[PDB]
Amino acid sequence: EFNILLATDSYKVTHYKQYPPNTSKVYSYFECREKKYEETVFYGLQYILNKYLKGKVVTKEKIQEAKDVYKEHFQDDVFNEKGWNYILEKYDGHLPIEIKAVPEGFVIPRGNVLFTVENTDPECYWLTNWIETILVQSWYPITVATNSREQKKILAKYLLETSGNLDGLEYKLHDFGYRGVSSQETAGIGASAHLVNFKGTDTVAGLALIKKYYGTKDPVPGYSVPAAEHSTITAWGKDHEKDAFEHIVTQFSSVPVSVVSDSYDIYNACEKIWGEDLRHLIVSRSTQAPLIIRPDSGNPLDTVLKVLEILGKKFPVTENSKGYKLLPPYLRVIQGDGVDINTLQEIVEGMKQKMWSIENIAFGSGGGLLQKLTRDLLNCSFKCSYVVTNGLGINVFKDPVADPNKRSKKGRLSLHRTPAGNFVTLEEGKGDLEEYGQDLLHTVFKNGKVTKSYSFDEIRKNAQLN
Amino acid sequence: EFNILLATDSYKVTHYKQYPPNTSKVYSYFECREKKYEETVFYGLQYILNKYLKGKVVTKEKIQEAKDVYKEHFQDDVFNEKGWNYILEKYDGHLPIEIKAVPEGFVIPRGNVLFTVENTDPECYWLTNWIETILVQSWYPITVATNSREQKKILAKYLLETSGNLDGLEYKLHDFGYRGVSSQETAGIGASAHLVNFKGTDTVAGLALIKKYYGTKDPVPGYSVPAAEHSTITAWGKDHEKDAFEHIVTQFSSVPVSVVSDSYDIYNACEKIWGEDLRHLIVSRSTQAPLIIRPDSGNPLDTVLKVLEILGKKFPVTENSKGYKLLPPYLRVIQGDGVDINTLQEIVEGMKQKMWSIENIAFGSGGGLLQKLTRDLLNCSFKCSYVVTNGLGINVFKDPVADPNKRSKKGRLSLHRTPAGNFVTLEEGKGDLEEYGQDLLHTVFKNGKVTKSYSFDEIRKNAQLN
Ligand SMILES: Nc1ccc(/C=C/C(=O)NCc2cc3cc(-c4ccc(C(=O)N5CCC(F)(F)CC5)cc4)cc(-c4ccc(F)cc4)c3o2)cn1
Ligand SMILES: Nc1ccc(/C=C/C(=O)NCc2cc3cc(-c4ccc(C(=O)N5CCC(F)(F)CC5)cc4)cc(-c4ccc(F)cc4)c3o2)cn1
């Protein structure tokens, strides 16, 4: 079973011997520090509160096991068995901590307070920063949900220019990242952060996470359609690629189907196999069940353009009201190789220069969507800003001489709306002056109980585009 | 509870209707595809065999739950209920699969087969590639262990040159990445892969993973020392940084202690606080308990060089047998900000240029060691290379015209030793000719059971440097 006594940075085990004596309160905050990515989607804290922090988390056996492990780890006795036994006997193992956050789904500019942590018992001054390590890991669902939303902005801009509406926007980016992430638990959390902005996912693990910790009115938050891989094509033999194509579109003639076509020669497959030999099985398909050709190699922009030119000469093309070319409704294209936020912008801009509408194409991303992200992308940081010693409170901060970008905020913090409708974080307890309205932070956790929750439905609504 | 029926890519559920009819065998393999990082460390397979693949993995309840989820996910009933009911009734929920693999810890050049997967029942031809997604995730411990070993190579070269031996090598790179990874399960896997090469870690979760799935002779595989953070220094007050230093070094006066010193001015704390105000508490410390000064901001190379020049003028410096300068044995330095494999080489080369020995310094890394890594750094890939249909086996392969590097191998594979002592992978069953000796892969999994395993002590021995 999970042991919260073994889920911290090793060195923090010794921090109860370094704080100033006669200290009764430690107050810390989380932010996406200022330095692209000017606003962040706050999401994922609710998952950590329920799975790791709520309820009875301390037992006599868990204290004894931490004592045994840390004895050999440090080659010394340094564990705070006395402090952890006080929580067990007085609060039945419930953590005496209060956490205030911003509602999940909110879009907030860089450099503002997103949540605060503090202890509610003077004896547990050391407990505030013990749970820093587990809490800081919220940088991952924040960054996945932000980076996915910024890719939605690019897609929405070019779809509106070339078509005149946003029909089908919310399944133009499919999640191919299950096998490209570092673990099973990461796959579930990352695919859920992507479903805040889109609807298509191949990463099954994200569905069960949402229903267990968030919930939705619909049966499932994500959907998929049948598709082929290189094994189900090459298994027929090099000389029988056309046999594998005919068989697969016939088994799935009533639903959409994606077919990877670059096993040997992608341009041969589009012009000769799809566009001639099997053309009669494509033009008869329904608008609700098109064929989706999938290239998978080469230069991403050059391959998409050459593919569209080949298909345009073999199938009837129309011109929409904005002047851009459009394929017949029974034929589309999906590009799912080498796709990140940078390449996605290069592709749609190139398609627009060649007078091709964004209606024709959708995208898929694997490692770029779920794995190629770090904690310094948005500079997520956790720092102490207020302590009480000998009954008097002081403001605490850091300010390295060689880097003013690492300066931290001072005192008790609060988040408010500006008169022009923006955000501002007030320091040194100045929010008590009541000049900026109501603090937008809400108590989500106190003394081992989750005091306020949000559904996955409200979160999607909070993260909408303008 | 984990359900293997929900731990695959969505599309793989629709693959049992796409293979050629009368197919009784699907045979697939894993490689680090060829085109820095010329050889890879194979580690991580055993963890996945025990936690997810062995034993009764199919029940009547798990079949019904996967059925219910897929009807909403696909808006159809494509799920293969009949295939999974046969495995339950015929094999008591045990997977009829055989896996062969190279011994864990082995160092193998790029472009060689590392493990193979095939079905042992003709009815379960679809099972081989169903477990591709879970097995491909072994890319992460392989890449962490490889990138960590390459960093050990750089440190060994410059330590031997500036000092004359390798004393202290196994803890010159400490793992700081607990808070910087994407989940709790990722932290345990990645820290365990780092301990293959080094012995210092702050990510506690790696210790329990090793003892449960690999085992070691000693009580624990990793160690740590007491250290400060920014909250335990700045909580004393801006004008009281000296008081915090004196307290911390007195509480830990008999063991090594690391003290972050860049809260306000790193260069002032080195020259005036450590080098003047508190110098009498440093020169009295034991060689087994030095003070370790830790900078944490600015340019990594420029800061380290200036910190060394300051201390060299406040403390007695000697010259070792190779001519390089050395601090007194009670004074060391650790640099744990912005360290990856690129900057680690720049720092160590610049230290040598200024005649400073590598004995004076250690390093720590967080996001660069455990998070800033993807699946295409080593080109880890899983592909089918052999099937049997109508009783006749054929060689299958992919070969895209726009990317010769994506070409895969054909037929039954085997790994052998060359007469000069190198590795070669034989294709198309040519290993049966017995011209290259015996196959180096070993059956590690068969019909639901682990058939061969390795201890963490054997893995470390196999992964040693030349
Ligand atoms: N490692 C890997 C893993 C996988 C792969 C290759 C995967 C692949 O090719 N996927 C194709 C694909 C999925 C998909 C899902 C949707 C989709 C998403 C959401 C909804 C939805 O909101 N609802 C459906 C259910 C409902 F009830 F109807 C109301 C709500 C519907 C469909 C749409 C298209 C599509 C793409 C391009 C097109 F042109 C057309 C469709 C889709 O295309 C490669 N490597
Ligand atoms: N998010 C985070 C997390 C942490 C931080 C800052 C952390 C910090 O400052 N850590 C200091 C530190 C630990 C440490 C461990 C060892 C160590 C590791 C392994 C062994 C070992 O091999 N064994 C244990 C004992 C044994 F019994 F022999 C068997 C084997 C011994 C020591 C050595 C030094 C050191 C650093 C610099 C020096 F100059 C010298 C030492 C060490 O220094 C920042 N952000």
Numbering used by the authors:
A (entry chain B), B (entry chain A): 8 to 42, 53 to 483
The authors write:
Overexpression of NAMPT has been observed in different cancer types and has been implicated to confer resistance to classic chemotherapeutics, whereas inhibition sensitizes cancer cells to oxidative stress and DNA-damaging agents. Thus, inhibition of NAD+ biosynthesis facilitated by NAMPT shows potential as an anticancer therapy. KPT-9274 represents a new class of NAMPT inhibitors and shows promising pharmacokinetics (Karyopharm Therapeutics). Using the CRISPRres approach, we revealed NAMPT as the key cellular target of the clinical inhibitor KPT-9274 by showing that mutations in NAMPT confer resistance to KPT-9274.
Crystallographic analysis of the binding mode revealed that two KPT-9274 molecules are bound to the NAMPT dimer. The binding mode is largely similar to that of FK866. In more detail, the amino-pyridinyl of KPT-9274 is coordinated via pi-stacking interactions between tyrosine 18 and phenylalanine 193. Furthermore, the amide linker is well coordinated via hydrogen-bonding interactions and the free electron pairs of the amide oxygen are stabilized by a hydrogen bond originating from serine 275. The nitrogen forms a hydrogen bond with a water molecule that further interacts with the carboxyl group of aspartate 219 and the hydroxyl group of serine 241. At the solvent exposed regions of the binding site, the chemical composition of KPT-9274 and the interactions with the NAMPT protein are different from FK866. KPT-9274 is branched and binds to two different solvent exposed patches whereas FK866 only occupies a single hydrophobic site. The first hydrophobic patch outlined by the hydrophobic sidechains of isoleucine 309, isoleucine 351, and alanine 379 is occupied by the aromatic fluorophenyl group of KPT-9274. The second solvent exposed binding site, which is only covered by KPT-9274, consists of tyrosine 188 and tyrosine 240 that interact with the difluoro-1-piperidinyl carbonyl phenyl group via Van der Waals interactions and a hydrogen bond between the carbonyl group and the amino group of lysine 216. Deletion of G383 causes a conformational change of the G383–385 stretch, which destablizes the conformation of F193 and thereby prevents pi-stacking with the ligand.
